[PDB]
Write a protein that binds this ligand. Structure first.
Ligand SMILES: *[C@@H]1O[C@H](CO)[C@@H](O[C@@H]2O[C@H](CO)[C@@H](O[C@@H]3O[C@H](CO[C@H]4O[C@H](CO)[C@@H](O)[C@H](O[C@H]5O[C@H](CO)[C@@H](O)[C@H](O)[C@@H]5O[C@H]5O[C@H](CO)[C@@H](O)[C@H](O)[C@@H]5O)[C@@H]4O)[C@@H](O)[C@H](O[C@H]4O[C@H](CO)[C@@H](O)[C@H](O)[C@@H]4O[C@H]4O[C@H](CO)[C@@H](O)[C@H](O)[C@@H]4O)[C@@H]3O)[C@H](O)[C@H]2NC(C)=O)[C@H](O)[C@H]1NC(C)=O
Ligand SMILES: CNC(=O)C[C@H](NC(=O)COc1c(CN2CC(F)(F)C2)cccc1OC)c1cccc(Br)c1
Ligand SMILES: [Br-]
Ligand SMILES: [Ca+2]
Ligand SMILES: [Cl-]
Ligand code: NA
Ligand code: NA
Ligand SMILES: [Zn+2]
Length: 807
């Protein structure tokens, strides 16, 4: 646009209300827009005499030219150099003071709430907190005296813009719409880039970031963004100046942002010897801020959050895979390259472009191949990286330490760099930092790692704001806080189950099923009835029935060895619950029972699956939720072949499922001292992360109304203190869960021609999940009846078992 730069920044420096063109600007971002008034540098970016008071400046006559002041009036003006009281008034630096618990806010008159200051650092890898501790005394003091996690998990892709905006919104990138550092939106026909103007257009930025949430609810906010050429000392001095505004003008929430250490980590690698200085310099900035807060008498008033967007891995030019080494048609695709790949057609007019032949040419083609291709709907569900038109159908998950590129010339005609990021957000090198310090956070407290999507809710709690709807799980981080906790109630059950008894004769069933089960006792007759009425339910249902949170028709079915919630609408269980003790034995499916399927006389023929549909469907087979291999006795084993325990499974998937049920469950019970397993189907044909309704299902077992699941989940719970068996646990729980994709081939697993012991568990690890992910995908609410606090349970449901080594 045209800008009238002849206006002036006199008394407007770093103003909080931004003006519209063509009026010239004086705010945090005027440089980015090439719109600052002609005198912005002279007036707003003063540099004279640098950033520190020296003995001889103490008591100086004010000179407005100076970058900051050391005259007696500077405290009332709010513009002293940050080291003023130290140099001139005999005070100590904040870092040199002992830490002393902050039990309540100690704020100046006129403060309505403790302000929040967010200190965000780009590329600050979680292990810097230990490895660089010697050179970061201010940051170490925040970390040791406040509340810290050993690391914080970013979202995928572990790039800057998606993570910073997740921090501000509590949303996954697929929902807020910033899905990469580079993007094409085909509806707009527009491209987003780190450099340039298109990124300022509001149509890219979805959701509601913290500054808008605050402004809408009457809490003023500093501007969160800083043009890159504004030096960091100036950004700090601006925050400090704002905090001296009159009460009715002063914001309550502020952000600082640093481009370091990311900037240097790209050039030198995460641990290059050149990295020490950027760490020292960021620590010095922290010290400027705390020193500035101590002079304003705000150092035992403000909550400070020190938070990073993602880490940094070692990545060099020579670890690049070229699509030109796989594809014949390389000029017919556009690639978004680097630590992830995104592919789409170069021309929508090219009718010979085919995603299936592209994926196939990219699948397991070279022995040590350093990237795997996925249609976006098949990416692990924990990445939540599919529901957006800006995410290309074909995705490449790139191994840590590697890049992908289209052709070799892209790499040397577009080595240089030693570091990069963007990989799978489970990767250790990508993890980042969280420290919270201040009256509202706990004192000298370590909390377990958590996801960055959770922080928005917490920042809203710190400011007394109602968060906009987001993907955090509100209350899961209550353990970080001394006060302002959020105490939610469990959601209300929407559908109550039916408890059917025996209602049908065997001959009513014409399902085409057969079983060799006819062999003829008042000891064992009473016992079979008791088991069907729920007498073993407390052994197998350890945490209450899951609640169904939508409107549906379902039955509770009890059995000796397992309990299920059977849907009359989907014709299979929503959930199947069972406990396997350490002592449990594994058995085979007896030869006479290989193809046995048995009608369930509790459930009508009309609400049952049928075996004839599976016979006729030449692609589809079936498996069982509660595994027949883990029956408690020969007699109990018959229950496992009920038609109501059956679910549709591709033969390729049954290789995965059978290995999990036959080998892995018993292994986990041995290692964890018993496990409780809840397993079930998931239907997400629109890949939105949320339970599909019946009318969304795209595939059925041929000739039938039996819907085919897109995924199968399991939730595996035991006692955190593994000296107690899973079924007699007095304290906190431990959980691992997975959401396995239900696919007709094992193309994802390049070693699949081998024995299941060489590949299946590696697949399961890749599809690890939070209980909360399963909740969203099924409309079920787990752990309704424990002895544990609800916030503790919320934390357990956000846990992700990552399988990475120790940081
Ligand atoms: C993580 O948390 C978030 C936040 O809670 C969850 O996302 C929410 O999920 C809801 C369900 O998917 C969804 O609710 C829908 O909202 C529709 C209104 O949408 C606009 O308004 C809201 C409110 O301000 C706004 O936030 C939305 O912003 C989205 O869209 C703009 C683009 O215009 C983006 O800039 C922004 O980034 C965001 O995009 C994301 O969501 C959209 C979908 O809304 C996706 O398409 C994107 O890919 C991206 O992920 C919008 O501006 C409302 O219209 C919907 O109601 C429809 O469906 C119901 C059925 O219940 C029906 O009764 C209605 O009539 C209506 O159907 C009609 O339209 C259909 C489609 O055209 C048509 O087929 C029918 O025939 C009907 O005519 C619905 O209520 C909510 O929008 C998002 N919010 C956000 C911020 O993403 C997310 O689910 C959580 N994730 C997990 C895994 O838990
Ligand atoms: C070279 N600098 C950059 O690439 C990033 C710089 N970002 C910032 O100043 C503040 O960062 C963000 C912040 C700051 N928030 C603080 C927080 F931790 F909550 C995240 C929120 C949302 C998006 C952000 O950047 C995309 C910035 C500067 C100018 C314009 C934009 Br758009 C973004
Ligand atoms: Br913006
Ligand atoms: Ca869905
Ligand atoms: Cl990107
Ligand atoms: Na079949
Ligand atoms: Na394979
Ligand atoms: Zn970077």
């Amino acid at each position: 646009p045209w800008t009238a730069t002849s206006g002036s920044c006199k008394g407007r420096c770093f103003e909080l209300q931004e003006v519209g063109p063509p009026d010239c600007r004086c705010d945090n971002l005027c440089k980015s827009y090439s719109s600052c008034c002609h005198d912005f540098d002279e007036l707003c970016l003063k540099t004279a005499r640098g950033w520190e008071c020296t003995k001889d400046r103490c008591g100086e006559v004010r000179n407005e030219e100076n970058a900051c002041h050391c005259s007696e009036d500077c405290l009332s003006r709010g513009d002293c150099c940050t080291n003023y009281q130290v140099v001139c008034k005999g005070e100590s630096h904040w870092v040199d003071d002992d830490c002393e618990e902050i039990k309540v806010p100690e704020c100046p008159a006129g403060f309505v709430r403790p302000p929040l200051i967010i200190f965000s650092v780009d590329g600050f890898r979680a292990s810097y907190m230990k490895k660089g501790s010697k050179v970061m005394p201010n940051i170490e003091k925040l970390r040791s005296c406040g509340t810290h996690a050993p690391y914080m998990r970013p979202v995928y892709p572990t790039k800057t813009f998606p993570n910073l905006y997740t921090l501000a919104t509590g949303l996954y990138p697929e929902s807020h719409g910033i899905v990469g550092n580079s993007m094409y939106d085909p509806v707009f026909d527009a491209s987003f880039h780190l450099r340039g103007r298109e990124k300022f257009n509001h149509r890219w930025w979805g959701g509601q970031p913290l500054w808008i949430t605050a402004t809408k609810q009457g809490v003023r906010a500093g501007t969160f963004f800083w043009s890159v050429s504004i030096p960091h000392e100036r950004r700090i001095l601006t925050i400090l100046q704002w905090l001296s505004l009159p009460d009715n003008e002063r914001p309550s929430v502020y952000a600082f942002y640093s481009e370091q250490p990311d900037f240097s980590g790209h050039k030198y690698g995460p641990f290059g010897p050149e990295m020490t200085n950027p760490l020292r310099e960021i620590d010095k900035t922290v010290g400027q801020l705390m020193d500035g807060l101590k002079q304003l008498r705000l150092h035992r008033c403000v909550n400070v959050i020190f938070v990073g967007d993602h880490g940094m891995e070692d990545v060099t030019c020579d670890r690049t895979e070229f699509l030109s080494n796989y594809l014949t048609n390389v000029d017919d695709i556009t690639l978004v390259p680097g630590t992830l790949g995104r592919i789409r057609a170069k021309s929508i007019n090219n009718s010979k472009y085919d995603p299936k032949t592209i994926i196939a040419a990219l699948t397991c083609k070279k022995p040590d191949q350093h990237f795997k291709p996925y249609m976006k709907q098949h990416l692990p569900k924990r990445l939540h990286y599919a529901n957006n038109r800006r995410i290309e159908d074909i995705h490449l998950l790139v191994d840590r330490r590697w890049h992908v590129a289209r052709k070799p010339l892209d790499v040397y005609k577009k080595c240089f760099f030693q570091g990069d990021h963007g990989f799978d957000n489970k990767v250790n090198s990508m993890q980042t930092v969280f420290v919270g310090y201040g009256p509202t956070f706990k004192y000298r407290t370590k909390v377990p790692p958590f996801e960055n999507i959770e922080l928005y809710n917490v920042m809203c709690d710190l400011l007394g704001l109602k968060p906009a709807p987001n993907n955090g799980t509100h209350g899961s981080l209550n353990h970080l806080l001394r006060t302002n906790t959020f105490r939610p109630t469990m959601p209300d059950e929407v559908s109550r189950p039916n408890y059917p008894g025996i209602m049908y004769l065997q001959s009513e069933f014409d399902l085409g099923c057969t079983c060799d089960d006819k062999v003829e006792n008042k000891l064992e007759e009473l016992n079979k009835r008791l088991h069907t009425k729920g007498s073993t339910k407390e052994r197998h249902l350890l945490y209450g029935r899951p609640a169904v949170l939508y409107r549906t028709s379902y039955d509770i079915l009890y059995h000796t060895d397992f309990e299920s919630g059977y849907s009359e609408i989907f014709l299979m269980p929503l959930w199947t619950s069972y406990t396997i003790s350490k002592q449990a034995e594994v058995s085979s499916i007896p030869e006479h029972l290989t193809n046995c399927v048995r009608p369930d006389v509790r459930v009508s023929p009309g609400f049952s699956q049928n075996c004839l549909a599976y016979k006729n469907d030449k692609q589809m087979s079936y498996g069982f939720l509660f595994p027949p291999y883990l029956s408690s006795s020969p007699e109990a084993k018959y229950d496992a072949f009920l038609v109501t325990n059956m679910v549709p499974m591709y033969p390729a998937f049954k290789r995965v499922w059978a290995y999990f049920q036959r080998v892995l469950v018993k292994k986990y019970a041995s290692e964890r001292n018993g496990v409780n397993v809840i397993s079930g189907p998931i239907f997400d044909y629109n890949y939105d992360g949320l339970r599909d309704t019946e009318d969304e299902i795209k595939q059925y077992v041929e000739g039938s109304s039996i819907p085919v699941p897109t995924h199968y989940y399991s939730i595996i719970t035991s006692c955190l203190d593994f000296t107690q068996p899973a079924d007699k646990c007095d304290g906190p729980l431990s959980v691992s869960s997975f959401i396995l994709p239900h696919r007709p081939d094992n193309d994802e697993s390049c070693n699949s021609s081998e024995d299941e012991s060489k590949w299946v568990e590696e697949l399961m690890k890749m599809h690890t999940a939070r209980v909360r992910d399963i909740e969203h995908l099924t409309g079920l609410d787990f752990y309704r009846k424990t002895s544990r606090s609800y916030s503790e349970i919320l934390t357990l449901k956000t846990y992700l078992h990552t399988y990475e080594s120790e940081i």
